[PDB]
Amino acid sequence: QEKRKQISVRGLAGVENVTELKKNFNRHLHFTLVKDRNVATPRDYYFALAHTVRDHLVGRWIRTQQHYYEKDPKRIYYLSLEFYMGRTLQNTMVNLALENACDEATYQLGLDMEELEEIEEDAGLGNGGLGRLAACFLDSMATLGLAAYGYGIRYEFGIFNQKICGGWQMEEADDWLRYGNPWEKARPEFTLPVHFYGRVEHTSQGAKWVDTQVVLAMPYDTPVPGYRNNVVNTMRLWSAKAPNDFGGYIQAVLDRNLAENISRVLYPNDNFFEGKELRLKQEYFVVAATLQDIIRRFKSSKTNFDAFPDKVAIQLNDTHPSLAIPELMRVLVDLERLDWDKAWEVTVKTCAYTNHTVIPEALERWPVHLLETLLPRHLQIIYEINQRFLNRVAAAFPGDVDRLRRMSLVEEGAVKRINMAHLCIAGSHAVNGVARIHSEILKKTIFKDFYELEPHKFQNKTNGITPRRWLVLCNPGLAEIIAERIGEEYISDLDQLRKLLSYVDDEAFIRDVAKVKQENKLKFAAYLEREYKVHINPNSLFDVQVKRIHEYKRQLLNCLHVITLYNRIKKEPNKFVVPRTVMIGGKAAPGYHMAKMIIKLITAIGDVVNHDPVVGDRLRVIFLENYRVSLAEKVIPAADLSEQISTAGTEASGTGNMKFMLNGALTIGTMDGANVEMAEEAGEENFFIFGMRVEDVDRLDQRGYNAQEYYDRIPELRQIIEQLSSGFFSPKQPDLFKDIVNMLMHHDRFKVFADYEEYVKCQERVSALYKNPREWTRMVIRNIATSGKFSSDRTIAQYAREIWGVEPSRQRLPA
Amino acid sequence: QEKRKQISVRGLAGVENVTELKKNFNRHLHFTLVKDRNVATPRDYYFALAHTVRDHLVGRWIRTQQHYYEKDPKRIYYLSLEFYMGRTLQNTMVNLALENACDEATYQLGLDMEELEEIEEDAGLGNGGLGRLAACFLDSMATLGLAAYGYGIRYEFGIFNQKICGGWQMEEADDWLRYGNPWEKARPEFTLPVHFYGRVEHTSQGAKWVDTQVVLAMPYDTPVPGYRNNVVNTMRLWSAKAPNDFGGYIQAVLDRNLAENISRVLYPNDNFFEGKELRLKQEYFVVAATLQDIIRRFKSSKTNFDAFPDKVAIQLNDTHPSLAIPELMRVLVDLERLDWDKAWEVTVKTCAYTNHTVIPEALERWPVHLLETLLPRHLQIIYEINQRFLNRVAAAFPGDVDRLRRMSLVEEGAVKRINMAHLCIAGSHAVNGVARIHSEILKKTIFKDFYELEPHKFQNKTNGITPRRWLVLCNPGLAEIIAERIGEEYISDLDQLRKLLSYVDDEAFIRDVAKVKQENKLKFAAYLEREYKVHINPNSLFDVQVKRIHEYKRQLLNCLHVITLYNRIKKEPNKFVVPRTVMIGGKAAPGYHMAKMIIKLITAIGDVVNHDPVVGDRLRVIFLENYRVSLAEKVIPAADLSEQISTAGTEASGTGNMKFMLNGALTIGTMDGANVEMAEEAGEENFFIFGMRVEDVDRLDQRGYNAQEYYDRIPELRQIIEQLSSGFFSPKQPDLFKDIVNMLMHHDRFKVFADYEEYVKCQERVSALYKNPREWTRMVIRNIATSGKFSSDRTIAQYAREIWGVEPSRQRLPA
Ligand SMILES: O=C(O[C@@H]1Cc2c(O)cc(O)cc2O[C@@H]1c1cc(O)c(O)c(O)c1)c1cc(O)c(O)c(O)c1
Ligand SMILES: O=C(O[C@@H]1Cc2c(O)cc(O)cc2O[C@@H]1c1cc(O)c(O)c(O)c1)c1cc(O)c(O)c(O)c1
Ligand SMILES: Cn1c(=O)c2c(ncn2C)n(C)c1=O
Ligand SMILES: Cn1c(=O)c2c(ncn2C)n(C)c1=O
């Protein structure tokens, strides 16, 4: 398409730039891929272009890191077990102003760059929100000119590739490195030792960790480009490698796999803790290798570690890298020979912890036996930390033994465990939630005792998304029509979107806003046909719930509504209803049974709804296979209605909600997480807010949630439960959904029936406004225009000023 | 050193060529390695140069393979489980005439290219002779313009890196790909399925192999340059990969390792069969993937497979890829649907087998149960092959049931097994030994019954070595002085070395020949000091035995001589003897106990000899650690005396013997293998030939080898055995060498004591001639000058005309 090359926000196709791009495209095709045009596949062409484009990163990559050496600013180390990065090619081109040039260059070579882009595998090294937040954060940190380093693990296999088979999820390994990763640079020369198991000997000069098994940590460095500032930061991902030295010789060589299994696969759990030793090993591996790099870089700068927190910030993405606190102490005390108290002064000032959930099954609580075996010296240090910390509690609250037991890092029981959130709080100067309501809920509940001891520690940092990936990349049509009115500065100053409120009554913007949405919808519809032979009605309302499958996110509530629409159609076939394509998508953790049942229910509903000739194209329900960052970039720009329907108090923030707001969808949701702040930014009048508020959930809990009451009082709801029990959605297996029915009736922690009625009526209001295109689009304008707060640039600037103590900059580097 | 850049056989340093080399060196340093000069290590500089040099291969690589597509010549597939390739960088530069240019280019950048070369890891994907023959063969095949493809396995770990610790061998994994391989091109797009286990169902149209576990075979292609002919052939090495589809999900991902273990490590056995299922899997993996490529290329050329043997030659390097015979039949019968007899016509005409040993512990005899489980359809086919083959025996020799049982592919016993040599003979049109004596010994003994049935099958192909690696690369000084007299054509026409017999009385050549040897010796001496802090006397005779540690190669015989020299010195301290550095080197297979004892004995002798102040620098015995192709290239040019002392009839050919002859060493050896032909080429008067001849070994076997006789009749020998028994060479452990003593006295298959006396006296003749420099050097000239026959170019030309049916060419391709 030539129209796309006329998108100004995609930059200049300079005649010489084009000429050079083609020359280097053809150079990589010959020397790097060893192909000629006669045997070259699209995949080769994608790689030629990827190599060509990565070459443009290299100069800035070297100069940026030298700049940091020269200026010696405080360094931000963002430790996370996940980096949900997605694809890199388009992102590279946008941040380097090369998109239109590459598009013209490939066009002259007879190629469609859009097709080439689709050959790239996602770097799916995350589960969901926490992982994708880390990716967004790296991008914003680069755009804000921070000396910032992402540190994590190079999983051989990312989040599993989901296939739906028989209506059921099947998992297949995500072999994302099969054809190579052209972005990363392997750094074997900078390999570091990590120790495991062993024993502690307390000798003359103190403790010594000995008799340890070594696993080498090999770093791969990936470039992280800011938005047109000539800044390229580094994401460093550690890969596990058997040590150089040592059933026989053959077996010994084979057994090198055991150690190398630590970096093999992402644990595919979203918001759920599994106490597997391999997972614990992964956490120590990232923390140990990462902290050796930080100490070395600290020493090779302009030992006295009193200035370590002036030059080092370690940000903990959840408790997953929590061992960085005992590990930093270990290095400082056992190897650098610092007194414990100075070491602890340094540690607390250097470390800060970000919490992502109040849900108990997600919080890390490691058995002491496991910590004792695998990391004996760390357990010792944790116990010491706990004694001095509880001593402070005692002195602050004399005689409150109850607070002592509650605040202990050590949790008593049949199995003694270490509470890793407690360790983080004790060992960090800053603790933040990711949305106002969540940060409030932490100081009033889960962490209230810690808030009372150290109020000053507790902060809020409302999550954000990068408007590069999540607008310019994914929705170029919308970015353009915005740029035509207000220019391009908003791309790294998203609060400038408020200027668009001046256009609520401009007929061309109203027309253009709707036209872009139509275009995104036609393109997504076409996508399902070619890739999955699925027919969807492009003049239907696109109702999308995409996110990991969960009880607390209430995909089930969405199911109940969908079946309601179906049954209402059957009772009154002749009555007009706004046509709808209900799209639900997301992965279930492989061991989460309810989530796999929920996926099966969505498809089972589809099997009835989509083949009923009375319904026809009035209602269609499809399960979007293999939801991942690449598919988010397709389906979200195409969405009319954003489903954000978690039980009030359960979704700490959400980030999918913000992506939908940024891309021209209206939101139907509870007052939970950032939904609260999104409605405050836009006005509640521009959101479909429904359901119980947190305080209402509490009152139910106070008197007990009896699901039976709602079933006995709501005829439409009872009908649906009867259809599920008796086997209307599973004729060949009538009892198939009994577990779903049983949880809803007797063990529903998330109170789906209690929001059922308000939800259904709120959906009626949605349909009503959809019948009025002009006013739909006008309310959409009011949303897009107030979405600026939810830029990750704002989030990061806040981290920088309020926790890290660094001042962000958007000034370009010379290049 | 500037002198080396004045070596004409290293080509022109063209001013523009130099300029471009530096530009691309600096380009790879920046864009490929992402370094600058301030942080660049030697290793980076080596990689920049490797990348730069590999770029010069690419154009010829593509054009050569297109040339083969266009002309459609018969294709040679050299199947081997080993490719002992060594380093590639210097070899690339010599075959492309880039050596002096790169040397000047790196010099102007302030770099020593010789230092850079030493950072390259060997591709040590072989054990010894059979492996290095395959490497030599690929090089000659390229130089002779044959459409030839090396096919094997990309082992993750090659032959183990040997460390001597306490006088003992220790094995460490050969992590040859730790910092990457810049020569190979990964080809994931050409991945192929290989099947294992399963069952056979005989249906309508015939048999079907079903219920199989799949292992993907991923090819990596390495360039193979001929000598200045613009030809670049391909070595394709298969790497094992878990299939795309499927204790839980985590465990399933981890368990992908099991399948990927097939390409993990070379079995480090030299001339020894180990019936491990993993080894069998390796053999099938290479044969199955390789034959799918051959069939596909056959079909994509200008199905009737009557012309398959006109377009395809499969050469089997030992019985290791023997399954190619049942596998080709399987494809032809079960998938292409050809009648068995036409399929068998095709198979025999396509396959040929090369035998490398007459020793029984080396020959492959696989248990039928193992073949039945792992490859059920192959076993079926083997049985059928055996029936029709034995039917031919029966018809040729009616009533000889004894011949039937002896010639059977099936060997009866407690465990029934398949004899893989027998399968090869039955399924191949050509069977060759690798030296005249060995090829004769096969038709008179091991394979006499097969020779009687099919005389026409049995050939000789005396082994060879490439004069590129083994003269021009490793000994540039010698190549030059040769080139000054006769020019450069000899480098690919080695028989031209006979012209050097005209110089036996030329004083400058005599001077120059000796001067080069002195230079190689001083350089090797310096090597031991820097890398191992070992002092050797450069005015001593360099007595070198390098090769895998073996009973049959008789390193022990060398030990006996060394101790004799030591004891003779002690009895008569004042008596002059020619100073000697005895150098023994080689790896023992990890499970071969005697070989590990032999290594310990060599070092133990050193511990006495090298610290006796009466001996001083008159005698020194050192064990050369980690003998591999790179070290062969150093030590052999430095050698005065080549130890080739296998028991007559045991070493099929040898190739180390030819490397020493080519590089200016005189040979002390038995009449075994190619030693017989080397002495015929030079004249026995120019070789130190000693010991029993094969017929003498036979007579001993006829009456029984009683070691006691030699001990009771030879005082000097009895003394040494007493020193070994009583613990003179092991004071802290007197009984340490009892196993050696016991084998020599009672279970010596290789009759060391029977050649002891003739060996010792032959060594006296060696020392005597060494006292006369002029006549030493003159005899060396007579050796170098007659070494031409032992070029692998001659060997390969013979394979091509006498087995493959293709005419070699040394004409350059346009480029
Ligand atoms: O199905 C079409 O695209 C798919 C859907 C889609 C989207 O919704 C948003 C987005 O950011 C990208 C995107 O890439 C999809 C796509 C998939 C392919 O396999 C492919 O080859 C391609 O060019 C693209 C399509 C159809 C069209 O008819 C068309 O003209 C076009 O440009 C594209
Ligand atoms: O020890 C020296 O080389 C080593 C021995 C050696 C050899 O015997 C033959 C050969 O083909 C190459 C060869 O490379 C060796 C070597 C090892 C190194 O670690 C190294 O840095 C190097 O430049 C080289 C040496 C000493 C010298 O004094 C010298 O001038 C020199 O050029 C080289
Ligand atoms: C019970 N359960 C699981 O068993 C689970 C999970 N996420 C992953 N798994 C395995 N969640 C959220 C959960 O509630
Ligand atoms: C007995 N034996 C072994 O046990 C052996 C070997 N090569 C390897 N091994 C393990 N050889 C040659 C051998 O004779």
UniProtKB/Swiss-Prot annotation, chains A, B:
InterPro entries: Glycg_phsphrylas (IPR011833), Glyco_trans_35 (IPR000811), Pyridoxal_P_attach_site (IPR035090). The lineage of its organism: Eukaryota, Metazoa, Chordata, Craniata, Vertebrata. GO terms for molecular function: glycogen phosphorylase activity; nucleotide binding; pyridoxal phosphate binding. The keyword Cell cycle does not apply. GO terms for biological process: glycogen catabolic process. It comes from Oryctolagus cuniculus (Rabbit). PROSITE patterns: PHOSPHORYLASE. This is Glycogen phosphorylase, muscle form. It comes from the Eukaryota. Pfam families: Phosphorylase. It is an enzyme of class 2 (transferase). One of its GO terms (cellular component) is skeletal muscle myofibril. The modification Phosphotyrosine is found at Y197, Y220, Y451. Homodimer. Homotetramer; to form the enzymatically active phosphorylase A. AMP binds at D36, Y69, R296, R297, F298, K299, S300, S301, K302. The modification N6-(pyridoxal phosphate)lysine is found at K659. Allosteric enzyme that catalyzes the rate-limiting step in glycogen catabolism, the phosphorolytic cleavage of glycogen to produce glucose-1-phosphate, and plays a central role in maintaining cellular and organismal glucose homeostasis. The record marks C102, C136 as: Involved in the association of subunits. Its EC number is 2.4.1.1. Phosphorylation of Ser-8 converts phosphorylase B (unphosphorylated) to phosphorylase A. The record marks Y149 as: Can be labeled by an AMP analog. Keywords: Acetylation, Allosteric enzyme, Carbohydrate metabolism, Glycogen metabolism, Glycosyltransferase, Nucleotide-binding, Phosphoprotein, Pyridoxal phosphate, Transferase. Allosterically regulated through the non-covalent binding of metabolites, being activated by AMP and inhibited by ATP, ADP, and glucose-6-phosphate. The activity is also controlled by post-translational modifications including phosphorylation. CDD domains: GT35_Glycogen_Phosphorylase. Belongs to the glycogen phosphorylase family. It catalyses: [(1->4)-alpha-D-glucosyl](n) + phosphate = [(1->4)-alpha-D-glucosyl](n-1) + alpha-D-glucose 1-phosphate. Its cofactor is pyridoxal 5'-phosphate.
